[PDB]
Design a binder for this molecule. Sequence first.
Ligand SMILES: Nc1ncnc2c1ncn2[C@@H]1O[C@H](COP(=O)(O)OP(=O)(O)O)[C@@H](O)[C@H]1O
Ligand SMILES: [Mg+2]
Lengths: 518, 187, 99
Amino acid sequence: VNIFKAGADEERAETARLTSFIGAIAIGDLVKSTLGPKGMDKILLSSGRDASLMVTNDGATILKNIGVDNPAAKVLVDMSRVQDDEVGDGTTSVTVLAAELLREAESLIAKKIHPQTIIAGWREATKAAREALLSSAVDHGSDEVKFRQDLMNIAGTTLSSKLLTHHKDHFTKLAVEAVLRLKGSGNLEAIHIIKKLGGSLADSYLDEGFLLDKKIGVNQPKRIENAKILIANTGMDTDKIKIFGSRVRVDSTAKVAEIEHAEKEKMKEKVERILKHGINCFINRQLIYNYPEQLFGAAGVMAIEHADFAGVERLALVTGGEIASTFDHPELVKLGSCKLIEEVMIGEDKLIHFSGVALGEACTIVLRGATQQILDEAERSLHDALCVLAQTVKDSRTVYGGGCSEMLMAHAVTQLANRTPGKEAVAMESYAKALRMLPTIIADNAGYDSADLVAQLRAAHSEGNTTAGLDMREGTIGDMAILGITESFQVKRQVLLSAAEAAEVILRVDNIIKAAPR
Amino acid sequence: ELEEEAEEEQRILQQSVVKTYEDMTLEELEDHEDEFNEEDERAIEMYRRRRLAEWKATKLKNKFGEVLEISGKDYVQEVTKAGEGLWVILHLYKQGIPLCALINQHLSGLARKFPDVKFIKAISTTCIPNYPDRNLPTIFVYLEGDIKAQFIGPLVFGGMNLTRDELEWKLSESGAIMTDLEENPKK
Amino acid sequence: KIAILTCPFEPPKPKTKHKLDVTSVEDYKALQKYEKEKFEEMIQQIKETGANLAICQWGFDDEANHLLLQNNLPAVRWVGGPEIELIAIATGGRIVPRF
Ligand SMILES: Nc1ncnc2c1ncn2[C@@H]1O[C@H](COP(=O)(O)OP(=O)(O)O)[C@@H](O)[C@H]1O
Ligand SMILES: [Mg+2]
């Protein structure tokens, strides 16, 4: 007898894990074609309204854009998005590793092994692998030149799997420089990425100051030397007295004429109070109406209308001023400083160029490609590189990439498995196989002999050479210490832990109950 | 037009499906007077007594007058306890945006034009936290707090052609959403 | 020392509907002065209790935010009701409804 609903169903057997495994493997196979320096990106086309088209390489936006149906696919997409939020890298890596973990899981359950046995084996294996990765982590930060070289290597390895690889030598350092302007503040919003079409992608440059996409007023000057910027968050509009319930109730036209004259005079006195600070520039958050603009033009200052919260925050960071709202006491927290406020033209548009800024705490990156999709992909991948660089500035521990860290931690898992009895050992062996399946995939997407390369790496790591990985520009087994394929320790640790946790949570379901759709 | 009232006594019929005393309310019910027969008089007085009684009953309902002075701290009381069945038209705005100024002035005119529904107006920023500036002109109507229509957009609203069409768009609810656009189409 | 607070950092207004008639430029200037001194007195009254931090349930505006900044008195806004109650129970203060 059926009891649920019309449209509600239950899969309480091998069918449930069949659906979960096939969905996770579909996610893994879709994401798999975008790993390594030789990975190839994808086109996302919307069948709905506006037919949005986006060319992308990373797995986070690929998985979040598509509409997944299988709940396991939803689990993988959520894990990828969470991992992108946490660090900003390895979303494709974590999704692929989870997919291979589930594949080895179904292979094991074919051999009639209880899922909790696999769970215990995986817990022990991930503990050992995390311990080995932590033991193999190299650290810097005390050094200055060595840490800068490490940052350059991290940017290179993060940016080599994307389109900017075509000009990687130009871009990596640029990204590093941007992070070097943050001065340790974990504020990625201090970085502005302005994307304008036209010209090769090698024309992109990190500005030596700031760029604002706003407009000068009518009568204000359009160039200043030795700027004294005051940044404000005042009204400058009609500017109601804010006492709700106030109205003019008079008996003549002279009275209302006098009241409007008083309103204009109070606005004039507010502008005079602003000018008393000793300024030649003024940046406001919301609109500036016609009378304050006229007064500013007459006085001889420069005013900016409608610079949003992000704009004023970035100007405050790059110039050093405070966000003013009340100008009663000009002697309190002071202004900012620059050296030129020239208007500079890019493409066909004009932007305000703050040069000679007092502080480098914020900056702008100009992205200029030949196609809007190229601009979007460059922006997303540059965001990933900046995220990783900021994360490794916060925590300078690094581990070698190219599969070397994966190979060594898989070797540790294998060594632990060899000394553990029972059916746990095969679970840990499957864990190690799934973990080693990543460099296999990188070589496959590259197009080399994956089996030979992986066997060579296994032999080299078992011997003791703990810095061996895939040299992809030639396709052999090289030394990541000499070559310089580094990676953030935080990124790899988060990838491992998140993938293992998602595999564990998915594997222990034996019943899927779907309610009737709305 | 009042010009048809003086051209000639011959205005027999043109597009008048019904013509009786039952739909003459007050303004015109007292301009015929001598043309209302005599046998059907008592029915006319019964009808006028009933309809003036209904108007007197609605006098206790249609006294709101103009706009009022609600802010964020008074939102919950006047959107969840404002009354039973009384329409409330919440407005979220900020000073500086011109289109929302247009719709504010038109709403203010509507306030005296229609006193049955007392809409309330509130500042966008200090009514809901972190409201983006991309939703500067906001209007949503409801009764008993169950939000019915919450159209959002700076330019999709079309405050230039709002006047009567979107006046009744806000006014007419509890039924088909598309009910008054065909009256005053933009074309 | 935290100043757990409920009423917003905005000029007061009675719950009953009201109309403040302004009839001359002198009255308009008096209204401007009333607004300015209301903000200044509010901020100085927050400061005079010695609090290093304030918390308001109902949020506030820019002319208050700059005053809180320039007097070296950090504060947060738009804190929910239950959050206000939990803060009061934790930090040991008392919820006050008026400055
Ligand atoms: N130039 C390279 N040489 C060797 N291995 C690389 C190189 N670039 C990336 N890898 C490896 O490929 C894996 C995935 O890289 P990538 O596609 O950049 O991940 P994501 O798409 O999350 O940025 C990483 O674990 C890294 O070790
Ligand atoms: Mg990467």
